[PDB]
Amino acid sequence: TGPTQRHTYYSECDEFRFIAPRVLDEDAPPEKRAGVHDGHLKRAPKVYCGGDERDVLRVGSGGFWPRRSRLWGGVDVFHVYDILENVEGTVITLLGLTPEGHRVAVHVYGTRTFGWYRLKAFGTSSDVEFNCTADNLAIEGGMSDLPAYKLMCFDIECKAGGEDELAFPVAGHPEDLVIQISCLLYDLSTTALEHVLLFSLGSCDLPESHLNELAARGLPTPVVLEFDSEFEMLLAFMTLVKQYGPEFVTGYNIINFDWPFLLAKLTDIYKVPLDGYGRMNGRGVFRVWDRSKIKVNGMVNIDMYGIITDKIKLSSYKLNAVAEAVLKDKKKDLSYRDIPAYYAAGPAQRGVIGEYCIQDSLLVGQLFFKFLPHLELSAVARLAGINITRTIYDG
């Protein structure tokens, strides 16, 4: 039988373009440690974690990252945060959470924005889905606290791989690789940090001092996901994005750098269709366009750089200067000038790259929870009668 509408995200993958820095071949002689390998490889993408080893696209009990996924590849009151329009007649899809924290999509038929509602083959990555008409819906008065939506705060590190290692990385150059992704998952209602993930191209041993500091701050112990190539890492990040499905996503300059870089790699280098990687399982919007906008269906992208430049007056809006100014937190900064020499040194030094990548995402979380931009944007979305996505990206 299978799904009525085809899922277009990778639920399976048995061959891919393998691109990796040759310096990770710590067993190879120096004459062959320069540049990147770039070829095809006929095996399933895989991820390593703490000595254990899994296929990236396998779903089961032993997963290295959290999921909020009912369906994978077809295998098996509410609060609305976002609304999709699609054709089946025009169907209006309300995306949301119940008080229990189940993900819902309610498909409203017969038509020709943020708050609680009452009711009176899935098209999406939800736990339950409903067909109804607009008369089956009413605003649930007396409910105003946000359900347990999830925020993903993320940051990429890139490494230019051409004859100048200090050159600004260009996504269209196959040898300019994403080498790490920090991915911090928070509960948006309680503000609790629930997971600290570091995606790493190559082996990566975070330092004891960093692990002890996070433990002393009472924060979750980081999970390091190690990968042999850029595609396996990018596929796994997108797999987490689809499987965990953070309703809100934040970062610093993620709209003008991180998202455009990732999506350029995924689209141009690897030929991965992005239209099933949002909330919808295929034929959904997932696009960056030019400073940039972004639309990912079912995901609210909030760039803290935009929020902060709009809100504080500063001599510099570099994340470090902002952290010193706003949080009073004097972050020590790893230079982009350091990254190539550290990356080539071994898993301990790639661990130092990892620490600073995690610390960056942690500051952006603190900034996020200070300004609470989602509260400002949802308030405007309610008042102005438009969805929160359009509230951000339209004038």
Q: Which residues bind Ca ion (CB under 5 A)?
A: 155, 251-253, 258, 360
Looking at beta carbons, which pairs linking 323-330 to residues 24 or more positions away fall under 8 Å?
A: 323/363, 323/367, 326/367, 326/370, 327/363, 327/366, 327/367, 327/370, 329/363, 329/366
Between 147 and 251, CB nearer to Ca ion: 251
Distance CA(97)–CA(82), nearest Å, equals 11
Least spacing, CB of residue 356 vs Ca ion, in Å: 7
Tokens of 379: 């308030």
Q: Which helix (H) or strand (E) holds 370?
A: helix 347-371
Least spacing, CB of residue 125 vs Ca ion, in Å: 25
Between 202 and 251, CB nearer to Ca ion: 251
**Distances, alpha carbon 188 to alpha carbons 33, 139, 163, 306, in Å:** 44, 22, 44, 19
Least spacing, CB of residue 305 vs Ca ion, in Å: 8
Between 36 and 357, CB nearer to Ca ion: 357
Least spacing, CB of residue 49 vs Ca ion, in Å: 22
Least spacing, CB of residue 111 vs Ca ion, in Å: 38
Least spacing, CB of residue 257 vs Ca ion, in Å: 6
Burial class (CB in 10 A: 0-12, 13-18, 19+), 15: exposed
Between 103 and 159, CB nearer to Ca ion: 159
* Cα 116 off chain centre by: 26
Between 94 and 183, CB nearer to Ca ion: 183
Within the chain, how many helices (H) and strands (E) appear?
9, 18
Name the nearest CA neighbour of 271 among 300, 315, 302, 234. 234
Question: Which residue minimizes CB distance to Ca ion?
Answer: 155
Place of tokens 């500091």: 213
Between 70 and 331, CB nearer to Ca ion: 331
Cα within 13 Å of Cα(320), Cβ side: 8
DSSP string, 226-250: EESSHHHHHHHHHHHHHHH--SEEE
Between 251 and 298, CB nearer to Ca ion: 251
Least spacing, CB of residue 340 vs Ca ion, in Å: 15
